[PDB]
C-alpha cells in the first residue's frame with residue numbers, strides 16, 4: 001500500500017534574517033550575484049571581510065566558544081586513530097585560521113603538516129604559534145582557489161570551513177582533495193550539521209544537513225568510509241559530525 005520509505009528532492013532552507021527558500025538552487029541564484037569576492041556584495045568576499053576583523057585567537061576561531069576545544073580535539077584524535085591504514089606522513093589543515101588543529105593534533109600525528117588559510121593576519125599568527133614545530137608550507141589562499149599536488153597527503157582536514165564554500169565549489173574542492181591524497185589518505189571533514197539549510201547572513205556561510213553533504217559527496221565522486229557525531233558535545237550547539245572520505 002502507500003508506505004513511508006526508510007532520492008533527489010529539493011532541499012529547502014532559510015537565512016538568519018528569516019528569508020526562506022524552496023530549494024538550494026533558488027538560494028544560490030539569490031546569493032551568488034555579481035563579483036563573488038566583492039567585500040560588501042560577494043558571497044566569498046563578505047566572509048573574508050568578516051574574518052579580517054576577527055581576532056587571531058582561539059576564542060576568535062571558536063566563535064567565543066573556547067571551552068569546546070578540548071573535547072573537539074580528543075574526538076578528532078580518537079576518530080582519526082580508528083581509520084584503517086591511515087598514513088602518518090603529510091597533513092594539510094584547510095581553513096586553518098591560527099593553526100589550532102595543526103598545533104594541538106596534527107603535529108602529534110603527522111611528520112609534516114601544511115596550512116591553507118586565506119586571511120593574512122590569521123595565517124601570520126599561525127606562523128608564530130607554530131614556531132619550531134613540524135610544519136611545512138603556509139599557503140595564503142582560499143580553498144576554492146588553491147591548487148594541491150596529486151598523491152601528497154595522508155590527511156586533509158576541513159573543519160568549520162566548508163560552510164564558506166558554494167555547493168559548486170564544495171563539489172570541486174572535495175574532488176580536488178581526493179586527487180591530492182595518497183593511497184593511505186583520507187579527507188577528515190568535521191562540520192556543524194542541521195534536512196534544511198541555514199544561510200548565516202553575518203559571516204556569509206551556510207550550515208547543511210547530512211543528506212545535503214552526502215549529495216555533495218556523491219557529486220564529487222568521494223565515498224564515506226567512516227562517520228560519527230562528536231560525543232560529549234554541548235546540547236545547545238549544532239551537532240558536530242566527522243566524516244572520513246576517500
Ligand SMILES: Nc1ncnc2c1ncn2[C@@H]1O[C@H](C[Se]CC[C@H](N)C(=O)O)[C@@H](O)[C@H]1O
Pocket residue numbers: 044047048051060061062094095096097098099100101116117118119122141142143144159160161164165
Ligand atoms: N573560502 C575559504 N577557504 C578557506 N578558508 C576560509 C574560507 N573562508 C573563510 N575561511 C577561513 O576559515 C576559518 C574558519 Se575558523 C576555524 C579554523 C580552524 N579550521 C579551526 O577549527 O580552528 C577562518 O580562518 C577563515 O579565514
